[PDB]
Amino acid sequence: PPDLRPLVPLDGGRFATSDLNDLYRRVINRNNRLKRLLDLAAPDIIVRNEKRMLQEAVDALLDNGRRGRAITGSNKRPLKSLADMIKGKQGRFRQNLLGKRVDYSGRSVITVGPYLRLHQCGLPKKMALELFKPFIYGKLELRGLATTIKAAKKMVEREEAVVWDILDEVIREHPVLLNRAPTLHRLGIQAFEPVLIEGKAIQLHPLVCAAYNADFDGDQMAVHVPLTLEAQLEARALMMSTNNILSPANGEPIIVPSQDVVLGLYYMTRDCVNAKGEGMVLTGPKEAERLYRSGLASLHARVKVRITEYEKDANGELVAKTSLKDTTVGRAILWMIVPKGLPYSIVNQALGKKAISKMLNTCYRILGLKPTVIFADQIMYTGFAYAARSGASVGIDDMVIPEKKHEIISEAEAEVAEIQEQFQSGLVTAGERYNKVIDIWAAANDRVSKAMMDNLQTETVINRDGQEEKQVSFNSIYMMADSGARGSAAQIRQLAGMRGLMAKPDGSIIETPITANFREGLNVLQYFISTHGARKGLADTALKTANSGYLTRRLVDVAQDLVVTEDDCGTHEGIMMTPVIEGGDV
Amino acid sequence: MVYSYTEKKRIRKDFGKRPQVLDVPYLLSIQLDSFQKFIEQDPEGQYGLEAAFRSVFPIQSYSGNSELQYVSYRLGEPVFDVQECQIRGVTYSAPLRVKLRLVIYEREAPEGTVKDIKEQEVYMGEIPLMTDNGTFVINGTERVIVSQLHRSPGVFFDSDKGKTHSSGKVLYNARIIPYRGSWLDFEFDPKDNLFVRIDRRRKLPATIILRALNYTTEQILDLFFEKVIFEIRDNKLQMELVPERLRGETASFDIEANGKVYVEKGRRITARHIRQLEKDDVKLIEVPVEYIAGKVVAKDYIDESTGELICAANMELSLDLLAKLSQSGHKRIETLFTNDLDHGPYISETLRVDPTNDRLSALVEIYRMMRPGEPPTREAAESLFENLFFSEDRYDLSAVGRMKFNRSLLREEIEGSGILSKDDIIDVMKKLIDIRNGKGEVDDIDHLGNRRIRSVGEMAENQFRVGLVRVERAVKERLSLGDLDTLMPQDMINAKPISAAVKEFFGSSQLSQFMDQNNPLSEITHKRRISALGPGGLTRERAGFEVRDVHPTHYGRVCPIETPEGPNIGLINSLSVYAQTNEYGFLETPYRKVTDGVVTDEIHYLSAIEEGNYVIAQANSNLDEEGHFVEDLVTCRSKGESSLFSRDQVDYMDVSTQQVVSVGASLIPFLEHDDANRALMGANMQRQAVPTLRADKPLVGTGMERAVAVDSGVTAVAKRGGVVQYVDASRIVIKVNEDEMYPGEAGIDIYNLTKYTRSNQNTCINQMPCVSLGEPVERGDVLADGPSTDLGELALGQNMRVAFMPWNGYNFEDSILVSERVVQEDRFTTIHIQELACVSRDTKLGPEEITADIPNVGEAALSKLDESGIVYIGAEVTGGDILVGKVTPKGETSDVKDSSLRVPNGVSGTVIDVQVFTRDGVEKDKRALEIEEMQLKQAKKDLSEELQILEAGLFSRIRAVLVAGGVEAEKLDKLPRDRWLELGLTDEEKQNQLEQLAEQYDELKHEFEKKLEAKRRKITQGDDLAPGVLKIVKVYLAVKRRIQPGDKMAGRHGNKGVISKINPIEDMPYDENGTPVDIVLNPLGVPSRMNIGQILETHLGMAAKGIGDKINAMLKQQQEVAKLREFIQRAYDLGADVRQKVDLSTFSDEEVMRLAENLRKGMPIATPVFDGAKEAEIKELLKLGDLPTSGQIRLYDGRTGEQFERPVTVGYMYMLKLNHLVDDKMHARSTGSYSLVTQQPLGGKAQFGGQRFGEMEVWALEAYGAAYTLQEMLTVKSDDVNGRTKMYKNIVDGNHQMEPGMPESFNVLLKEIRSLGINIELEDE
Amino acid sequence: RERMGHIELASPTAHIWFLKSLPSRIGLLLDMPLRDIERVLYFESYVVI
DNA sequence: GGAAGATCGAAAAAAGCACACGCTGACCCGCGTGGT
């Protein structure tokens, strides 16, 4: 039909060229020439050539490049035949049927909203005004501010005061679907309650970022507006952020503090052996908060406070127990946001990432879902606030280099020089000499890392009653490493110890390791050596995406039609599961 | 040392310790020098257009007793200047006129001489000319042709790593790759058979190509094998023995000679027995007949008595065969020395498998392999074989190809014929066989010594040669059949193919691309780029892993960290700072020669191949002022590996510490403290920073900013020294010194700065003067600052007071907290210029007129339009406003439809420029006349300034002449100067001198009038456009984009983020002095992403700002210049044995005051890429000011006023604003336009469109229940038109219910399938 | 968007989808090689009905 | 002991190569040939 192969108007009298129209014109011309040749009783050669050329034209129309060279148009390129526009990634099946562009949708960059709740997101006023235009029109017509659709359009274009109130009314409980561009798994699109904000960037809850695999480095997100009541109810009940708390892949939780909440809770829940207002007795957590805010006590002061903890009996009733507990001011303050059903043992320790995750798991197991959500929101708020209050910072003096690094390096160099002398003497051949050199350098790196960790973990010494005492260090780098916020043993080792051995692009280990810290200066040779591994990793990451996407598409296709359609087969068959062991490990 | 005038204004403090021995070369030379090898006249050719002309010409006429020859070529002067071509949109190009000579010889005489010669000069198209900045001007746009990293022509020996055979056996192959011709391949079969392939076709036995070379079987065995002679004498079966031939083989019989049993049967021959054999020098060893049966005869043996051959060449011997040959009367036989490992019988097996037996059979087989359809013919096969590899026109191994071919085969000569030869193929086969045996090793494909760089000149020459052969075919066709009596050389050729080919190459190519204009660094990086893609190169999808790796040969030639991140990683690289190309195109790097343990200052440029032989010491090698390394063991690199070496074994040393990084990577301070991935991210992100309206120098730099700014053409560099005669915001006039004045010259240089010109990335290009009136200048001194430049130094971002601390989760992952003071000061505000074009064409019904009268528009809309129908300059137009009024004739069936250009929805700005291009023959409107008038006014102003200075000089001369005789100087000033000319003196030589001066003045006036007339003619010349279009009107809109949440900012150390909140000033943390911080950054990014360089830069910037604050405080107290001199000298003298020495004693008091005024905002510090400041130096600089050495101060919370419990790292960091603006990234649509075929919402933000709900989102919805949501996304919101209407009506009516309906995409698919012979339908049963 | 049309070919023409989509339906049903099909179809040789 | 079925290996062909977004360039034309 002509409308499926339209002639798109252009500037002036020009018209857009369509490959199908050219193919049809060529076929028609060939057919007409063949008809006029047959009517004129042309010789056999001419009619045979005309028939062959008509067959070739029909073949090109049906499938251009299937046989021979594809017919090219005015653009020096093969034309798009009927088969070319139905198959492939750009065909109708994969471009306009399985996926398609939708209305009531927008796209914008994402910033961080710390004040938002787990079920809320920040939507700019302009985006919400554009997306919810028909709802605003309907509400304006119902309330009588406008009499026709044109009047409502003019009023929303002029952005009158009543328009903002209408927009606030229509988005009270209307969920919006936020989705990131790579939708790897189910949690890539989630429903949130919109909150009107200024600015031009969508505000996203931090706790869901790990679910979205999204960072605030320039990432963008798309928003969709459900229309019918059924879609809104599915968004509220199935795709809401609060409903998605466990990963469908393995059942692990997906809402965990990542960077600043963990650091804040770790700093707040810590003890100093000699701090301000140590050893005093407090009536409760409220007194501890009052003392900390008034400046009369420190957040790490070891005190005794009266804690009332509620526990669930067999019948499920909450029974209170009040007792004096030896704790810190920060732990007592944090106890305020803990719900009643939880015990005090969760907060009476240095709260790292694992500790916070375990406390959230216990809260979910004991109480339920809504108390868990409220607890998570309160945890995020408290962590952010006390991380801001702490004022932790990283400086060039925080990466302490051990004084024994030079001695260890010199000993390793002496050992490898002795090995080289032995090789020159001829007692040891190249392969075993290389192996011994690698082993010596690995041992030296391990010794340097151990010495640096020993120096860093307990560097701080505190004078208690005139006596020196060793305590866990308050170094910012060490605090970040220990709390689990960011960084690991390997990265801290690279920062404060030697970088260790490096590998060639083929995989062979280089004899001379990088004995320079990141705090110190890496010379040209060491940087060039590290660039091999850096480029190898970056190239692997760049090339992995296409293979991963193809595999995911194939798996989705092969398992697209499998759904649960029954309750019980009654089958007595099954598979026998045993622990997996291969000669040393379970 | 001494400092230039522009450098003395603000001297950057340099912390570099290692003295520099070689200055940084010109960055764009690689782009320029190559073009200098393409258009320059070459007396011996081998380069440029001369090489192509000599390769094509002379041209025969199929033995037509006539030809045409090429004499010389000349490039004419371009019609328009570079600025003129940019303004008018034409291509900056120059004509090429070639001298041709058609010679016709006498007929009927094969040896007859010339009967006629016709010489002429013919124009053969216009070729583009590269500007002074290494860029081309094509269609008014600046394009850059990046260099291509490809595989050098020659022979390469490789082998699969035991993969295809699936048995661990390596199949060696050798590939001959010509510049032009057919690729040749030799491969080893798993059964140890040599096969030959041409153009990757079906394999054939290798001996076929030898037979086709007129080689007999005996000759082949002689060439590829060693002969062992067996001679029967006195019934003992003796043979000539070479001891080495019996190494590693078990003795089947007893080896006894001269009565001594050397070896007995059953025991393998040992090396000691071989040594004893050569001690006794035995040549005849008794051999039993059983040993013969395992030998292959070498040459044919034919019985003389019977006349028939007993045995041919190359087959296994047998007992009957040896008996027959023994009884035939032959006493001598020759066999092939075949060993199990040293000398395999590959050639013999290949001959056995070879079906051909003669040269003609081999030629027939080759022809039937190449062209199976055509039956073989003797002449056809001969011609095909000759044209395959032995034809100059068809096959051409380049000079570099021949050099590599000879080098790989260990040939002393490096020159030879382009075509192949029998000796070359024989040597290649022998080397491949030796490699298979074990001698030698395969080549490295990714080795930088086997990879060539093709620049603009080489590709341009290749395209010109292609066009030359294209026109030569037609020239031959026309000349052979036409009449030779009246054949002018001009009409025989056609410039159309040459022009089309050159335009196709320069305009539409994979390597000729739009030049990035985000910043000068972007242009520098783009010009110095090497891409492995393009024609005759790798592809993005099929690149692989090995190509993208960092080869050890990349040291000093290719930057390891500067490369795009994404699909094209490792395929696009940046040239190193000191890297340069050889004569053959291979990359080479400088080194300093070490002789007798001292490091000399002589510089040798070593290539990748030749640098492996020597031992190159590391750049970071400590010297003792005597050129001797202090350490006994120096870490050097000998053969692609780093190891310790004795101090006397070194041969070369690195010229500089920046030799390993590129220009972009060398601009990052403290790069050695940053991770390689983070350094790569920072280097990539640096060239994406949009310029700001105010340029701010980097407080912490590397000292390479000056070179980058000067080398790029953004800034205005004085051509000659002098004084600033006239300064202005738009132009500068410099009165040059008399030393540099040319004879008969006015003596003024005029620089016209570009003011608010749209760039290729819709950014603002603005030049601001940096000199004052009367200020002396010198050659090479910057007169105006281009975009992102500050006093001749590159300035990408701004210095922000940053504090590293978490702040209420507003910098949670990567977010950035920005104070309101940054917004108020307009520091990060950018200017974006967008061009909108409206063209009036000539339709079939009628032309399109651009008039101010438009139907169905109100008077308010036409208020902004002028009488000519074009928007006024300076008018502020919002979205939907009308800019240019145009009417298009309606159908035949008012009669005019509105096709006026309108501002796109959501786009605002101020009209700053309107450009009208009118085709010749079309009457110009008022706006075009006004533009031409203003251009003529500017040209007349310049010419009038020149005429005024020249006339003043001439009038001074005439006054001096007249005063000598007249002596009326007291009254001469009373009358005006013109009346001096009409005054006459008494009759002597003075009157003649006055007449000569008057006629010179008249001639000067006439010449200036002629120049003005020529400029007016050039200005008023009609513009050339595409056929069918009459007029073009372009309107430029300028928008000031301010910073806001969602905008993407970054640093130089790979740290990036988006603004999360614009907090009020009072909420920012403040120090004891109450100064708030500007930016708050999350410390959590530092540990995981290992970039301590940003922390060190923060500390150094804090120290620099402390020094600047001290200088400002001393300036505000009106202190004497002595205190300022002492303090600045103390600041500059800080450090440990730094190479930079600044003596303020030589500086004048005014110069010291100017330097202090420049430094009052902070002292710039130069930190080299690998020779930067140490921690101790930073602490000393911090102690110089009143700042703590720890780098952390005490901060108070703005909101609560409570001191933070721990010190926080505060300082000054250079932050950049990337070209990712949130307001340019928004989009929102409820309902809009729909597509035609699919009836789906459109795509993109320029046209109102919706987001794409792709396959992954559909799968995610299917993972949930989401049935109704998916149905409404697939039908109601996208395709179902009735569903769309009903849903909209229901929502307006307050009912949230939908009707699914039938999507139109499925109907379109059904019709598409039905268009074929396949019937598809829906069944209602 | 729905109404279609037809073109009356002067001579019969083979369908490529049933021609060069392996296995060749014409060749498989006629039990004779695909190259023979291509040769007889594109007017280069004769075949006996 | 020779025709026919089974096997091996090289060659030719076909199909595949993640998602989202942004920008620019082209959407004539040149021979040729009968109609006039």
Next chain:
DNA sequence: ACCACGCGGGCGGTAGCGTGCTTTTTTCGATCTTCC
């Protein structure tokens, strides 16, 4: 005698579409070997 439809559109060359991807399917030519 000049000109407007028209049509197919490939460069280069005694044609054939190749030079740095991987996997699967089909086809044919050479070799073997089974057996009546």
Next chain:
RNA sequence: UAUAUGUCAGCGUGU
């Protein structure tokens, strides 16, 4: 909601 007229290539950005 139906508005004024969108299709192909090449290049680039973020996962």
